[PDB]
Write a protein that binds this ligand. Sequence first.
Ligand SMILES: [Cu+2]
Ligand SMILES: [Cu+2]
Lengths: 341, 341
Amino acid sequence: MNYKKNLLLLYDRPREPIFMGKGKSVFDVPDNYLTDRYRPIGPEIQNRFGELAEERIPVRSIALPDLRIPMSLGRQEQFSLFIPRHRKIAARLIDIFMGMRNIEELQSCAVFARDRINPYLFNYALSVALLHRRDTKNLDLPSVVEVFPDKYVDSRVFEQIREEATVVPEGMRMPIVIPKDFTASDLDEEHRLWYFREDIGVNLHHWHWHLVYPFEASNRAIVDKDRRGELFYYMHSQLIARYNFERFCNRLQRVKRLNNLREPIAEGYFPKLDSLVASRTWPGRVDNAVIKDLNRELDQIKQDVSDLERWIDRIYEAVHQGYVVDESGNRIFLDEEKGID
Amino acid sequence: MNYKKNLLLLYDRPREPIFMGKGKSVFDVPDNYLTDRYRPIGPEIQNRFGELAEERIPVRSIALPDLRIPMSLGRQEQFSLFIPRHRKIAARLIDIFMGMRNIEELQSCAVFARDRINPYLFNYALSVALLHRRDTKNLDLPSVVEVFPDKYVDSRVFEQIREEATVVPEGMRMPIVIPKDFTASDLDEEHRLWYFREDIGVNLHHWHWHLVYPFEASNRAIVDKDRRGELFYYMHSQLIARYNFERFCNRLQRVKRLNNLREPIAEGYFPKLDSLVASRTWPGRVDNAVIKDLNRELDQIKQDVSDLERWIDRIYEAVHQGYVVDESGNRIFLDEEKGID
Ligand SMILES: [Cu+2]
Ligand SMILES: [Cu+2]
């Protein structure tokens, strides 16, 4: 039906309020769906863009579960599925969208939530729901480059795109060249691998692989894909094989592993990205930075380097022993078939 | 009987020989009870200190176990129950006092030993014996501040107390003020917690807790007290809770743990104590001191930092595993009830 196509409009202009109109459509957002910032001037807004729209999508007012947890993450904050706390927030939101059985209420829940939660988070939570519901199948989700270009492009272009779009009329607009080999000069021999590390393509492949094979997800059905463990091994293993190949093609040696975490990291990297959602830039890492014990009270991270080292020591032991031990105390054997998985 | 009250006289003036007379009494010691240095002129002494005594306590000459081990520790040496070797010495002396199963024989053994063994050690060994024998029970032991003030007071006062006591007649003596907040200036923010760290009260509580609940003794008796493991956890756990409270009341943050033993220790501490028994002062620790492998041949300490690290790694493993392993190889489960203990 149309509904499938109407959800795709949520991906349009993630930080523009949902009442501003996406593509050749606009949402008829109720007056109690406007945010506390915008609700007190709903009258002037609803009928700012009210004429110039071909379609007008109605939206039914429903109950809407408590969105406290989803809204705990700030709007101008970064996301990340690696951070323990974000995992609990996303997995909870995924659960909400997933838990609205009807495809019309999913549209209503979404439209409300969209302007209250972190764009990056919203995009993820929706993407996961759509991809793994039965009514929303074979639906072609817009490339995350197109919705979040800030994660894929030198920040320098943004003020050029703003200039070009404001000054020059449509049709006469010049294509904006995206800088390549821009993160480091030739003093850093690592800069040669820009065409691989910083290639849009491979970064998209990595992001998407983790979409379809998450490692944490309410319901152990979508996490439990056939041989996803072996997949995780192999896919990442092929990344380095391909990387090591490209290294040899740039007069470099094979990549050296992180033998031990106490020794400095020789190769720094300043990525030159500016998050328009966080309105900040991503921090760089300096040459010879050292790993340090984390205490990020807000993010719910309390981990020491020795914890990491302890995990490694134990995993090595299991691998050499040839078996692991489950919570229960039983032994499971790392055989030829399922061992790697 | 009197005997109970006569043992309390041993705690009086620990370094003054037992024949010098304690309170308004004096002991009538055999000549084979006199110490090797004083015995060859002994008679000239019994007479010299006989004066100003109301009572004379007789003491019968008994068998006396070998006091080789008790006498191994120097008289002018420090005594700590943490040092492996001292544990074996004290536990042996405790065994002697404990082994005399009548209150008269205990008095004789004590009177002999007192001037041959380390005062600090004697005090401990006696304290433990009296507190846990049947005939000597509910006896009020003199405060260890009163018997060993050197462990509780700035060394500066001692030469004032000596001056005051020698110059000024009794009755006209001014009370000696004990310096507070004397270990560090305001450049060290840690100095604010003097009223807790250096308070007489809390230091006495800690000392006494370890008196009644040692971790090393003989058999289970006098170590095997209900839930002493949980007690050890909780008591010490409350010390830090209370400390962390007092920190917040002095505009400081929560105490940071010793993550790892290889990194320097930022906070030094010079305690300003002078052991009158050792006739030396306690050493200080400088800022950014580093833990180093011990090789104290005398004390019987041959321990590497890695040994400590290895113990920690194993304990963590057990805690996560959820069970420990006994000497025999069997598994014991850290359940909700007895796990902590
Ligand atoms: Cu990955
Ligand atoms: Cu203690």
